């Protein structure tokens, strides 16, 4: 009767190339099944590991057990470039926490990081800490991106549209 769920560990749904991603299937024989773009992969452990991500590892992922049904598709985006603003989702309920991360390729030296909402700065850090909103207001909706000193060059990340909902 119960239905399986795919779990991203860590939470970030958009990652860069060469990153490490672990997908976990929940449910309850102790085998599992994994599918990518509606296509079974041969890994039948409870957790599927991506040691170094490539852009073709993108797409939706589904999993099932012999004691659970087919899960709902969990999308994954493997992005190219040097900088990337990471989020666990892109739609938030009001008063929920928003945890963002400005991540560099293979964690290359990242300093002077700035998080921006609608082309205006929100938080500045000397090193490379995470951006956090404890309780989401409706004014926190908009386009987010980060910018910092990746080694020697100033890099601006891509845009992520975050929308705050009410009911």
């Amino acid at each position: 009767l119960p239905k399986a769920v795919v779990f991203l560990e860590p939470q970030w749904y958009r990652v860069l190339e060469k990153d490490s991603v672990t997908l976990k299937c929940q449910g309850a024989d102790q085998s599992t099944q994994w599918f990518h773009n509606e296509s079974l992969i041969s890994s039948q452990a409870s957790s599927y590991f991506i040691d170094a991500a490539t852009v073709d590892d993108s797409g939706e992922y589904r999993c099932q057990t012999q004691l659970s049904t087919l899960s709902d598709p969990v999308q994954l985006e493997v992005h190219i470039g040097w900088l990337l603003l990471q989020a666990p989702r892109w739609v938030f309920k009001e008063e929920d926490p928003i945890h963002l991360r400005c991540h560099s390729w293979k964690n290359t030296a990242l300093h002077k990081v700035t998080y921006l909402q609608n082309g205006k700065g929100r938080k500045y850090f000397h090193h490379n800490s995470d951006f956090y909103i404890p309780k989401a207001t409706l004014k926190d909706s908009g386009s987010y991106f980060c910018r910092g000193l990746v080694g020697s060059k100033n890099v601006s990340s891509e845009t992520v549209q975050i929308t705050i909902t009410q009911g």
Partner: antibody
Framework: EVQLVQSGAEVKKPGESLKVSCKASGYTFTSYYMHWVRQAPGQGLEWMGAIEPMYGSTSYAQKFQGRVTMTRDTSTSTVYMELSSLRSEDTAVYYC?????????????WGQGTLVTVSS | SYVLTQPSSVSVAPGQTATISCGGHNIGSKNVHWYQQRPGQSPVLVIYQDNKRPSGIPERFSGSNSGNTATLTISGTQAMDEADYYCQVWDNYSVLFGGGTKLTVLR
């Protein structure tokens, strides 16, 4: 399960350094922050800082900035805290605490604590 | 820079309900968490995010956050509830604790 086992008690003299370890277990170590909270004898809890174990980013309370140092060893799931220039006021039980829900808004698990007596 | 204000002591008869306050400037703007610390033990999370309860905590523990006062409420208090209770918030990339309230049982 989640376990937080800390190092044993320590005796210190004024001006020395303390370094305490916190071995995590029972979860994905790199997915959760790690708090460090101290409590003087008979006083209340006091936040000292936290560390992001995936990429080593830290954050300290301003009373301990320039004196506290936090590191982690991902291959051993161990978090390290260090405090320099110890005085008798630094006598306290030092706890490590796992940050909940992939940040350090609050702590959902605590270690057993480590007694550090700074005394002549 | 942010200040949380807790009462020093709180006394309650057995079975009766105890309430512990935690004051802060617009504390309703924040999610407030509470910890229980028995005399010589490690702290234990009892309420997180104003009202939510972790697994294994009795339902008689309840939390409320509205205005400039967050409140922890224990219904039928028992001798095990005799401990110190600390409120905690996250403010500008730092974690802060209240002074702590000692729960006393009357007789």
């Amino acid at each position: 399960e989640v376990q937080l086992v800390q190092s044993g008690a320590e005796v210190k003299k004024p001006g020395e350094s303390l370094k305490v370890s916190c071995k995590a277990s029972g979860y994905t170590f790199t997915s959760y922050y790690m708090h460090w909270v101290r409590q003087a004898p008979g006083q209340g809890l006091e936040w000292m800082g936290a560390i992001e174990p995936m990429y080593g980013s830290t954050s300290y309370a301003q009373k301990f900035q320039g004196r506290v140092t936090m590191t982690r060893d991902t291959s051993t799931s161990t978090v390290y805290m260090e405090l320099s220039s110890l005085r008798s006021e630094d006598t306290a039980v030092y706890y490590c605490a796992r940050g909940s829900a992939y940040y350090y808004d609050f702590a959902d698990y605590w270690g057993q604590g480590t007694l550090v007596t700074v005394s002549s | 820079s942010y200040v949380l204000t807790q009462p020093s002591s709180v006394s309650v008869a057995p079975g009766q309900t105890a309430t512990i306050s935690c004051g802060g400037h617009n504390i309703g703007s924040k999610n407030v968490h509470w910890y229980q610390q028995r005399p010589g033990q490690s702290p234990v999370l009892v309420i997180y995010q104003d009202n939510k309860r972790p697994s294994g905590i009795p339902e008689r523990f309840s939390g409320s956050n509205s205005g400039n006062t967050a409140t922890l409420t224990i219904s039928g208090t028992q001798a095990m509830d005799e401990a110190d209770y600390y409120c905690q918030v996250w403010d500008n990339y730092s974690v802060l604790f209240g002074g702590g309230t000692k729960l006393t049982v009357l007789r």
